[PDB]
């Protein structure tokens, strides 16, 4: 299980993130889902910073680090003829 979690930390993201940041992201997401169930709404970052005992700007930096990239090989149009990358100035 250690080696498989090592692999899921290393080779599962296109931008490589070190393992401690991956684990605190996973902890943040687990706490976010659990407080979504219990609180009934999506939590505020100040509440999550209260929960994981860090600062809200640290929460925002973790949220910035948690965003996975997107592909340029889907069509924005419902009629599919133009790639998404055909609109980038």
């Amino acid at each position: 299980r250690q080696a498989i979690t090592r692999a899921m930390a290393d080779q599962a993201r296109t931008i490589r993130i070190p393992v401690h940041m991956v684990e605190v992201i996973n902890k943040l997401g687990r706490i976010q889902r659990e407080l979504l169930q219990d609180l009934g709404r999506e939590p505020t970052p100040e509440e999550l910073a209260k929960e994981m005992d860090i600062t809200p700007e640290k929460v925002l930096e973790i949220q910035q680090y948690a965003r996975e990239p997107i592909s340029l090989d889907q069509t924005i149009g419902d009629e599919g003829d133009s790639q998404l990358g055909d609109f980038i100035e």
């Binding site: 169930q37 009934g40 910035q64 340029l72 790639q83 990358g85 055909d86 609109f87 980038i88 100035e89």
Partner: protein
């Protein structure tokens, strides 16, 4: 008629219809409250039988409950779907961009079988959107409309395609369920059977019946009468049940060890266990009515049965045998007949309740999977349905459906007719249904079952013809998802008044006469031979006794928007289609004047349009404003009605709501109290009434081009207010934060005059193209300076000013006033997306005049751009000095077969002038069928022709004969309908009389500024080095393939090289060409384009040594 605020519009109605037009948004509202389980629905469906009314949510909960562990040792149940109140009002949602919704509370109940408890929590299931009283949904502030979707109903479908190489009819069957598995019982090319299941390519009946568990003798005693089945029974090659089961398991699961017991149960699970195979209640009703199985008992047990399977096979072998009818044992005999995939008995309509129900069912599927998961992994006697239920896939499913879907579209509202047209819309494309390109030609056509149900006129004329129609006026949706249709039933020749909602199959049971049937005012027909419609679309002259149904009115076939065209019966369907399709594309004028000539639909359609404030409760006016009317009810209470003034619609058009009553007025319930965008005095108004002539003038009205008078510019007769909303956000970054302020490095102070202390402009500031709206600057950081810039900053004493300015500049060709500023802030606790600090939106508005190039059209398909706006003097003007307003073309009229515009022109001059026929010798013979209070008419009086009961040739011409003069004794227009015009340019009279009159025309949303587009040097792409395209940018023009063909065909090789290289992809070439132009030098040699080098690098990347050689 019979609406208390209706203005006196006079009709030509010869026939008095009993049925009135229903509440046209019932197709949305009743479906949605069916899904809710409103008490309104609860009583209403119970008023037509329906001993057990079940809501859609109630149906999903009952078909899901109970949930069970694999052991059978504990169970979960749901109960009591109840709604809360909404979380915000409508206008507050629409302003603050919150979606309009209401929470769900569901009483769950967990039971341990091992010890025995109930666990009754009240589960917050999640937010749930609500249909507004306009029949729409508001999502994230945007306003969306769910489109109704046609699919084929689940059931048993029958056909044959005879093989021309074989000359044998090949009868086939697709037993299609909902959410199930395929099975088809064909007849092969040989004398065998095609019992292929879920595409497993090859099966006889014997493997299925011994797989069912019949003996050969049990096959014999039912199937006794065909050499077909006897040949297949001698092609059995496997006798014994378990051998057939393992053969099925082999052919179904290959790559799997066989077991004989699970093979019988998996087959029992795949077709009879109703948790993985669920043809609906409608599918069960369709099959049971098709084979006469449950003729005396209501619908349950939504899976199949072996009785139904053997009845299917027997019907198949008799239909491949040739029979007329057959009774199954225990069943009423059904006629041996095949099936259509286009008749409306087979093609149901998934409404919005069906769609939301399916989305909630597929969300609860994943939620149920999670419940099955943590039923075992969690501990026992410590869990609770709070711990069990995760609501996230369900609420994600709902949010995914209301967004990002084929069926969830924007409310297409440039005018309330297009609102009422995007509602009540039928689509055959989407998820579940057929796609566009895979679908053939036959479903695009019009079966005769469309009559009275789906309008055979109104459809888009693009690459969607036939796929998207609308409802008829009087159509209504069956609780089984079919399209029912009213009929006046006629008994013994006497027409009764029992209105009977008939659907498509029971239409074919009977035979139906028409609205233009002569009645003796006591029901009875006077013709012994009457027009009638037979089941296959046949028309006969019936002996006048067998008819059991008559139409409720005329125009029962037609849509709403198409029923707003006078003289429809004179126009061909092509230009009528074009006119009805453009009639949803009118724009709101600043005046909105009612037409002189119309139908009886303009009042009822506008009060059902939503965008007319209707007096809800009868009372008296207390105090008015331009923004609200305080009504004084007749018992106590008072009520305001907040007018929406200058609201932006979804396409830039305005949404003013002016009141139309005074302070002392007394109003009643159901009365119009405030006109909307395209309304006047209650009824519809999509344009203006203009004096028109039909001469060809100077080649300016060449081939549907239209000229105008300058008076339309002078009096603002065609003038719309366009409102455009711009947007910019303050966003976090690594280098700091985006800042909205006046400090905007490098720039004059004069261009910073209109903005406030913090960068945004103030209300009322006229902007041009390319000005500053939101003064906003971003941090950039430090790079090296070029030494020339270093010298210049050394000379001028300027700092670096390290921050970089990206202010919100207004784009090209857009100007006008600035009405309103809505601004959101993260620090002010507003909700914002992530990393965003301040979101400001600016309402920009302008008042566009009419202009040469604008697209105008009448109500008949006669469309066209504006050729030339002539001045007011150079105009063919009438003998009184009145100029004509617009001038159409003659040559476009006869070849387009649309003379309804000519009849509208004659009728419009008749209505403008006003008439009073002579009754000195009584009624003249032409005006006999013409009803009373029509013998006179005041000038500029509103009239109405109903669609298929309108003015005849005798009535129109005879009324045109007597057309009393205006101010002096001036009979301007003769009996023929023409008049003598004078040339405003030359001065001589025209040698021939010219057809004149008043036609009601429209202004369309295909304006010039919305289409003009040009670029010298703008933004490029990122991946390729091509110029970026689209009017949102500066944008380029696709020099396509046939263009390359044409310039090869001239042989202009150098210009082709120009266009392919140094305007597209020669990255080092573009700058040198721009430089050589500005220096005024020779245009240099075109280099190697980028798209070739990309291909070269990809071929080198694909392990292919591409070599380039000169010798």
């Amino acid at each position: 008629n019979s609406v208390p605020g209706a203005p006196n519009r006079v009709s030509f109605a010869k026939l008095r219809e009993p049925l009135e037009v229903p509440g046209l948004l019932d197709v949305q509202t009743d479906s949605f409250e069916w899904l809710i389980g409103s008490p309104r629905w609860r009583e209403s469906a119970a008023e037509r039988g329906d001993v057990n009314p079940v809501g859609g949510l109630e149906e999903v909960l009952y078909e899901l409950s109970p949930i069970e562990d694999f052991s059978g040792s504990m169970s979960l149940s749901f109960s009591d779907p109840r709604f809360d109140d909404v979380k915000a009002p409508v206008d507050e949602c629409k302003d603050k961009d919150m979606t309009y919704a209401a929470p769900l509370f569901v009483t769950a109940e967990f039971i341990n079988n091992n010890t025995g408890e109930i666990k009754s929590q009240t589960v917050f299931m999640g937010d749930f959107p609500m249909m507004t009283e306009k029949g729409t949904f508001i999502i994230n502030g945007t306003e969306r409309v769910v489109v109704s979707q046609l699919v084929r109903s689940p059931g048993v479908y029958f056909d044959e395609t005879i093989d021309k190489s074989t000359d044998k009819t090949l009868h086939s069957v697709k037993v299609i369920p909902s959410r199930g598995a395929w099975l088809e019982f064909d007849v092969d090319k040989r004398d065998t059977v095609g019992v292929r299941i879920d595409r497993k390519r090859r099966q006889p009946v014997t493997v299925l019946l011994k797989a069912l568990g019949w003996t050969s003798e049990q096959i014999v005693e039912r199937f006794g009468f065909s050499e077909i089945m006897r040949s297949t029974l001698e092609k059995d090659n496997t006798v014994g049940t378990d051998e057939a089961l393992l053969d099925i398991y082999r052919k179904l699961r290959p790559g799997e060890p066989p077991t004989k017991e699970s093979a019988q149960t998996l087959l029992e699970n795949l077709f009879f266990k109703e948790k993985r195979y669920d043809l609906a209640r409608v599918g069960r009703y369709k099959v049971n009515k098709k084979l006469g199985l449950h003729v005396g008992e209501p619908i349950t047990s939504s899976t199949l049965t072996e009785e139904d399977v053997v009845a299917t096979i027997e019907y198949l072998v008799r239909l491949h045998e040739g029979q007329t009818t057959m009774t199954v044992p225990g069943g009423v005999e059904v006629p041996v007949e095949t099936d259509d995939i286009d008749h409306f008995g087979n093609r149901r309509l998934r409404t919005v309740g069906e769609l939301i129900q399916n989305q909630i069912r597929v969300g609860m599927s994943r939620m149920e999977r999670v419940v099955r998961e943590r039923m075992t992994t969690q501990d026992v006697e410590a869990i609770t349905p709070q711990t069990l239920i995760n609501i996230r896939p369900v609420v994600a499913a709902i949010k995914e459906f209301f967004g990002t879907s084929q069926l969830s579209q924007f409310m297409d509202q440039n005018n309330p007719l297009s609102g009422l047209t995007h509602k009540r819309r039928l689509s055959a494309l989407g998820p579940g249904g057929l796609s566009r390109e895979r679908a053939g030609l036959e479903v695009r056509d019009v079966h005769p079952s469309h009559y009275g149900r789906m309008c055979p006129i109104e459809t888009p004329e693009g690459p969607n013809i036939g796929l998207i129609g609308s409802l008829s006026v009087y159509a209504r949706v069956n609780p089984f998802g079919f399209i029912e249709t009213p009929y006046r039933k006629v008994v013994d020749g006497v027409v009764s008044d029992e209105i009977v909602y008939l659907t498509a199959d029971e239409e074919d049971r009977h035979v139906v006469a028409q609205a233009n049937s002569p009645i003796d005012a006591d029901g009875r027909f006077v013709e012994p031979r009457v027009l009638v419609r037979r089941k296959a679309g046949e028309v006969e002259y019936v002996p006048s006794s067998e008819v059991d149904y008559m139409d409720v009115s005329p125009r029962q076939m037609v849509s709403v928007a198409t029923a707003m065209i006078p003289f429809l019966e004179h126009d061909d369907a092509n230009r009528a289609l074009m006119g009805a399709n453009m009639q949803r594309q009118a724009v709101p004028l600043v005046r909105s004047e009612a037409p002189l000539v119309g139908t009886g639909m303009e009042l009822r359609a506008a009060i059902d349009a939503g965008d007319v404030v209707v007096a809800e409760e009868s009372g008296v006016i207390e105090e008015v404003s331009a923004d609200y009317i305080t009504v004084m009810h007749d018992n106590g209470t008072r009520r305001t009605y907040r007018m929406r003034k200058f609201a932006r619609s979804n396409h830039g058009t305005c949404a003013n709501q002016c009141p139309i009553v005074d302070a002392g007025d007394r109003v009643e319930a159901g009365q119009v109290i405030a006109d909307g965008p395209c309304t006047d005095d209650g009824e519809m108004a999509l344009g203006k009434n203009l004096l028109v002539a039909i001469m060809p003038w100077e080649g300016h009205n060449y081939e549907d081009a239209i000229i105008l008078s300058n008076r339309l510019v002078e009096e603002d007769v065609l003038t719309s207010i366009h409102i455009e909303e711009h947007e910019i956000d303050a966003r976090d970054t690594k280098l700091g934060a985006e800042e909205i302020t006046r400090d905007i490095p490098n720039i004059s102070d004069e261009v910073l005059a209109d903005l406030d202390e913090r960068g945004i402009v103030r209300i009322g500031a006229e902007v041009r193209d390319g000005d500053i709206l939101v003064g906003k600057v971003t941090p950039k950081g430090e790079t090296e300076l070029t030494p020339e810039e270093r010298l210049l900053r050394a000379i001028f004493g300027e700092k670096a000013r390290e921050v970089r300015d990206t202010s919100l500049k207004v784009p090209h060709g857009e100007s006008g006033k600035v009405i309103g500023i809505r601004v959101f802030s993260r620090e002010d606790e507003d909700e914002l997306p992530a990393g965003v600090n301040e979101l400001v939106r600016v309402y920009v508005a302008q008042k566009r005049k009419i202009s040469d190039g604008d697209k105008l059209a009448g109500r008949h398909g006669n469309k066209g751009v504006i050729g030339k706006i002539l001045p007011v003097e150079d105009m063919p003007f009438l003998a009184d000095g009145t100029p004509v307003d617009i001038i159409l073309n003659t040559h476009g009229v006869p070849r387009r077969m649309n003379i309804g515009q000519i009849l509208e022109t004659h009728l419009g001059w008749c209505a403008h002038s006003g008439w009073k026929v002579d009754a000195a010798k009584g009624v003249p013979d032409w005006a006999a069928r013409l009803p009373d209070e029509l013998l006179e008419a005041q000038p500029n009086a509103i009239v109405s022709t109903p669609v298929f009961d309108g003015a005849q040739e005798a009535e129109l011409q005879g009324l045109l004969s007597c057309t009393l003069p205006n101010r002096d004794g001036d009979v301007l227009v003769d009996a023929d309908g023409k008049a003598m015009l004078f040339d405003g340019r030359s001065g001589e009279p025209f040698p021939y009389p010219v057809t004149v009159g008043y036609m009601y025309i429209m202004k369309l949303h295909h304006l010039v500024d919305d289409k003009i587009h040009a670029r010298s040097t703008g933004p490029y792409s990122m991946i390729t080095q091509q110029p970026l395209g689209g009017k949102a940018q500066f944008g380029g023009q696709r020099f396509g393939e046939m263009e390359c063909w044409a310039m090869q065909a001239y042989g202009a090789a150098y210009t082709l090289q120009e266009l392919l290289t140094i305007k597209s992809d020669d990255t080092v070439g573009r700058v040198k060409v721009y430089e050589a132009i500005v220096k005024g030098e020779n245009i240099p040699e075109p280099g190697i384009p980028e798209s070739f080098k990309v291909l070269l690098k990809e071929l080198q990347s694909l392990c292919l040594n591409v070599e380039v050689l000169s010798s």
